[PDB]
Design a protein around this nucleic acid. Structure first.
Ligand SMILES: [Mg+2]
Ligand SMILES: [Mg+2]
Ligand SMILES: [Mg+2]
Ligand SMILES: [Mg+2]
Ligand SMILES: [Mg+2]
Ligand SMILES: [Mg+2]
Ligand SMILES: [Mg+2]
Ligand SMILES: [Mg+2]
Ligand SMILES: [Mg+2]
Ligand SMILES: [Mg+2]
Ligand SMILES: [Mg+2]
Ligand SMILES: [Mg+2]
Ligand SMILES: [Mg+2]
Ligand SMILES: [Mg+2]
Ligand SMILES: [Mg+2]
Ligand SMILES: [Mg+2]
Ligand SMILES: [Mg+2]
Ligand SMILES: [Mg+2]
Ligand SMILES: [Mg+2]
Ligand SMILES: [Mg+2]
Ligand SMILES: [Mg+2]
Ligand SMILES: [Mg+2]
Ligand SMILES: [Mg+2]
Ligand SMILES: [Mg+2]
Ligand SMILES: [Mg+2]
Ligand SMILES: [Mg+2]
Ligand SMILES: [Mg+2]
Ligand SMILES: [Mg+2]
Ligand SMILES: [Mg+2]
Ligand SMILES: [Mg+2]
Ligand SMILES: [Mg+2]
Ligand SMILES: [Mg+2]
Ligand SMILES: [Mg+2]
Ligand SMILES: [Mg+2]
Ligand SMILES: [Mg+2]
Ligand SMILES: [Mg+2]
Ligand SMILES: [Mg+2]
Ligand SMILES: [Mg+2]
Ligand SMILES: [Mg+2]
Ligand SMILES: [Mg+2]
Ligand SMILES: [Mg+2]
Ligand SMILES: [Mg+2]
Ligand SMILES: [Mg+2]
Ligand SMILES: [Mg+2]
Ligand SMILES: [Mg+2]
Ligand SMILES: [Mg+2]
Ligand SMILES: [Mg+2]
Ligand SMILES: [Mg+2]
Ligand SMILES: [Mg+2]
Lengths: 274, 47, 93
RNA sequence: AACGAUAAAAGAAGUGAGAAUCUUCUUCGCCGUAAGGACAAGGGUUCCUGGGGAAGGGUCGUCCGCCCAGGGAAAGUCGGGACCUAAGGUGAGGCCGAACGGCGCAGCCGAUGGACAGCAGGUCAAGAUUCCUGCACCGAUCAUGUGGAGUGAUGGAGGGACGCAUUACGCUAUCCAAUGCCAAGCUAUGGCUAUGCUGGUUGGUACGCUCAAGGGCGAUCGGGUCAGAAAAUCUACCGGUCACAUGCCUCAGACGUAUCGGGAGCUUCCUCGGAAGCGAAGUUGGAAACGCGACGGUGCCAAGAAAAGCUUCUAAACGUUGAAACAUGAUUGCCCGUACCGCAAACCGACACAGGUGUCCGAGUGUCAAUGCACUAAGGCGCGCGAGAGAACCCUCGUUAAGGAACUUUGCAAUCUCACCCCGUAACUUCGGAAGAAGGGGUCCCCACGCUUCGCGUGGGGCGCAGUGAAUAGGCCCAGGCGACUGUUUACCAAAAUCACAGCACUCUGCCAACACGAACAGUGGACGUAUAGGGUGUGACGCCUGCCCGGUGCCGGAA
RNA sequence: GAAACGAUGACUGAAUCCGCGCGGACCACCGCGCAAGGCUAAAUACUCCCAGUGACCGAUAGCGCAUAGUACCGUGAGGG
């Protein structure tokens, strides 16, 4: 489920580790293994836009086509469930009966070797490419596009499930994992099931290092900084605030709606993530 | 302890040189505004 | 042309004994090539050249009064012929 | 005052106008995981020869890294380019922008990396996988042949192609032993007269049914069009079929034989000492790599660059009486870098400066081992002021009667302690720990006996004050405050109670996401991430927990 | 400011002769005028350079320099 550790070192107690005992051990396919360099958070101007990014371990991209519509109407069989360091989830290896291999995202349960399909003409099985309209009411799914062909941008993190509330017009209502209700153009695609990994959410990190190894340079209380540096700075003691909680940029954190008030999305969200 | 100036030929040239100084406007400007002061030392290319 | 290039001969204990060996040594023209030098001496000395080497040398920066100056930098070249084909004009030195 | 580290100097000899300082000699002292050697970066003639002595040298100088003049550096195989790509820098058209300009796909530049044909010896005063000797290898163009029908890209696939830690067998370097082999002479000062003492003891290439641990390894027929734009002897899926142990394959390395070297020295000439000729042996035993066999085995989560060369298919295309492939001979071999200093007097520190500078090699003895400590070898030095004195005082160090923290702001400082083995070891605990707790005892030399060795237990003897005998080498404990912890911090007066942290918590955010850089509808980070994600804020392991006040401020919502 | 006029950024974009524009809000009168198309020597400004002069300097003066942007400092711009 998760490996644990006897307390032989101080930090080797709470520490916890994944269960990769179901990972088809394999060096990911060569003609699918692009090269990701890291970006300190600096952009093409060399200034840290994102903030607090740094190093960790060398990583590579595995192309994971999300629009299965490039090969729907035929099926492939699962070949392996290797380990991507860039995703919160696990990924799986597709052997299309007609030669071409691909990589797709791996869902919850889907045992190594199950032969899965793609096309509107597909059984609600785990791992099928299926349009959202042909999906049963109340069914469990992930990997949802905001338009046909675009690419699956919904339900991708570990153990996530967008849930078909049901059809309507040509826009199917949907339950986002955040707790939101979204209209989706029924010619949008889907992949049946929960994401899996699932266990992820729970692995205790355990020590500084473990943060570093995923490349998350140490985070910083502005309450450390000085006036010159950032808002909450100054003081003579472990000091409070003296103003309302606020980002470095002074635009309040803690209870301040930040979404842009006018938008085109505003007539596709029937409810709010509350 | 250890000092400010640790020479690096490639650095020196790729930093202060002539292809470099001409690559930018303000370096053209540095150039001719040097020339006027009768520099023999035009540029670290001329070392 | 087929002469201009060979800016001089080389003069020293070394050069002399190499000559004695059948290996001849000249200053040449910095910009030149080894193919160019081969063509050169092969032309103006009617010899079979089978061996060659070159080496660019700086120039002893020297002062004559408050005038620190560099000398012109040369390109020493060595050639080895075949079958004891000694060159005449230098064979007396 | 100081002459730049307390590594240390003496006597003889020589030279000169002049010598503590320069040159020979014989000793002494210091370094020896360096204070030796080889590179890189940097410097630039500082290298070698002959000369000079104004100034540079912390004194002196006849000397020098200073002055003068002259010489010295050699590559098809090393290194870079004529090949490749990373970050990054670029970049016609393209996207933007008061101007200058900012972006930006392909392409191109970019080594710190990929790729790649040569090794052994010899020598100038001064070069060396370059030159010279010996025997190789690679590409290129032509020719005589085997030719006798296919060659195989600007696109296809394969391959190149990679993490940390631990580790099995084989082996090399390379080092030790010896009444192995070779060579050399000698008898010391009481003895030894060799079974003593000193030194040397295989490098390359070629073959050879010789020995060899290790390591990689399948194959062929057919289907599916829909996979690689298409093609397709290829590559990928599906299916069938093939003596599991394996053989197929490779040969680090060793043994033999041969040949080329090298080899202690020996000889001969002779001019502050070299020039030249010659040349013996080649053993058993043991140790052993971070190197090679190698892209081996196993475990682990943090999940480990790209591109060309390369290998395979086909497209056009010209050929299919000269298509590839091959053997041999000819022939060809571009460009810069190679001196020297390079842990330092030659680079960066204004200096011939107790600093700084990245990788490699770095022998022996003793030591549980070791790049550790003492002493050494090869090698490199005695650090460019000297001599005497032997007061105060100052610096670094030894010893210390009685006492033993009386010192003092405080045991600050300094001593204690010190390694390996064996006995033994507390409250407390998160059951890991505390813990090397504490506290003891042993340690050297000889003979016999056993045992798995160099080695070690046992028994008896021996000596000294003492036997990790010299050097490297923890003082310990009780009890609090703060933080949990490993970490971080004020370059040059503060290293902690700071900060970070794993953990938890509030909110924000549904993708052209918030948020952030931005002439700006550009483009970028966020992220090739998707609410088990991302931002911001606060607390700061863990454990039991986290109450009362919504009036003011902020925030969320509401609508007359 | 009573703000005319020109001038443009964004919205609007009339008359062409019994017509158009101005006369410092605005109105009549009465005057000066031809927007939406272009070129134009001359006088004027400067002085790297050449020459002539001087109740300008003569070696701390005079340019920074009897010459040198060199020696020297600075990673650089630059100082000198
Ligand atoms: Mg935090
Ligand atoms: Mg502060
Ligand atoms: Mg402060
Ligand atoms: Mg402020
Ligand atoms: Mg404050
Ligand atoms: Mg050359
Ligand atoms: Mg000189
Ligand atoms: Mg004195
Ligand atoms: Mg001294
Ligand atoms: Mg002394
Ligand atoms: Mg003598
Ligand atoms: Mg005399
Ligand atoms: Mg001395
Ligand atoms: Mg050294
Ligand atoms: Mg010398
Ligand atoms: Mg002197
Ligand atoms: Mg003399
Ligand atoms: Mg650019
Ligand atoms: Mg390189
Ligand atoms: Mg090579
Ligand atoms: Mg090369
Ligand atoms: Mg050769
Ligand atoms: Mg081994
Ligand atoms: Mg013996
Ligand atoms: Mg005797
Ligand atoms: Mg012996
Ligand atoms: Mg390319
Ligand atoms: Mg050089
Ligand atoms: Mg000195
Ligand atoms: Mg020094
Ligand atoms: Mg060693
Ligand atoms: Mg040693
Ligand atoms: Mg030592
Ligand atoms: Mg030395
Ligand atoms: Mg006296
Ligand atoms: Mg005492
Ligand atoms: Mg006593
Ligand atoms: Mg103390
Ligand atoms: Mg216990
Ligand atoms: Mg103890
Ligand atoms: Mg006794
Ligand atoms: Mg005893
Ligand atoms: Mg100690
Ligand atoms: Mg702490
Ligand atoms: Mg400080
Ligand atoms: Mg301090
Ligand atoms: Mg107006
Ligand atoms: Mg005067
Ligand atoms: Mg003057």
């Amino acid at each position: 489920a998760v490996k644990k550790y006897k307390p032989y070192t101080p930090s080797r107690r709470q520490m916890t580790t994944a269960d990769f005992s179901g990972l088809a051990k394999k060096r990911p396919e060569k003609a699918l293994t692009e090269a990701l360099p890291k970006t300190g958070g600096r952009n093409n101007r060399g200034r840290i836009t994102s903030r607090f990014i740094g190093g960790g371990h060398k990583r590579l991209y595995r192309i994971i086509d999300f629009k299965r519509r490039d090969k729907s109407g035929v099926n492939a069989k699962v070949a392996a469930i290797e380990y991507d360091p860039n995703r919160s989830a696990r990924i799986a290896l597709l052997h299309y009966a007609d030669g071409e291999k691909r990589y797709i995202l791996a869902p919850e349960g889907l045992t190594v070797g199950a032969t899965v399909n793609a096309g509107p003409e597909a059984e609600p099985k785990l791992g099928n490419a299926l349009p959202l309209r042909f999906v049963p009411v109340g069914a469990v799914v992930h990997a949802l596009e905001l338009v046909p062909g675009k690419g699956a941008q919904l339900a991708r993190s570990a153990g996530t499930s967008v849930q078909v509330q049901g059809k309507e017009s040509d826009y199917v209502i949907v339950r986002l994992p955040s707790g939101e209700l979204r209209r989706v153009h029924s010619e949008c695609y889907a992949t049946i099931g929960a994401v899996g990994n699932a266990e992820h959410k729970n692995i205790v990190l355990g020590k500084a290092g473990r943060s570093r190894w995923l490349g998350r340079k140490p985070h910083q209380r502005g309450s450390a900084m000085n006036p010159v540096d950032h808002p909450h700075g100054g003081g003579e003691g472990r000091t409070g605030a003296g103003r309302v909680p606020v980002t470095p940029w002074g635009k309040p954190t803690k209870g301040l709606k930040t979404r842009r008030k006018r938008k085109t999305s505003d007539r596709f969200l029937v409810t709010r993530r509350k | 302890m250890k000092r400010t100036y640790q020479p690096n030929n490639r650095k020196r040239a790729k930093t202060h040189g002539f292809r470099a100084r001409m690559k930018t406007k303000s370096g053209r400007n540095i150039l001719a505004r040097r020339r006027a002061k009768g520099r023999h030392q035009l540029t670290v290319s001329d070392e | 042309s087929h002469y201009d290039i060979l800016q001089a001969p080389v003069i020293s204990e070394k050069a002399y004994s190499a000559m004695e060996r059948g290996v001849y040594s000249f200053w040449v023209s910095p910009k030149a090539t080894k193919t160019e030098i081969k063509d050169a001496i092969q032309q103006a000395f009617g010899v079979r050249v089978i061996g060659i080497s070159t080496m660019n040398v700086p120039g002893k920066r020297k002062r004559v009064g408050r005038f620190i100056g560099q000398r012109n930098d040369r390109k020493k070249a060595i050639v080895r012929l075949a079958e004891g084909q000694s060159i005449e004009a230098l064979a007396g030195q």
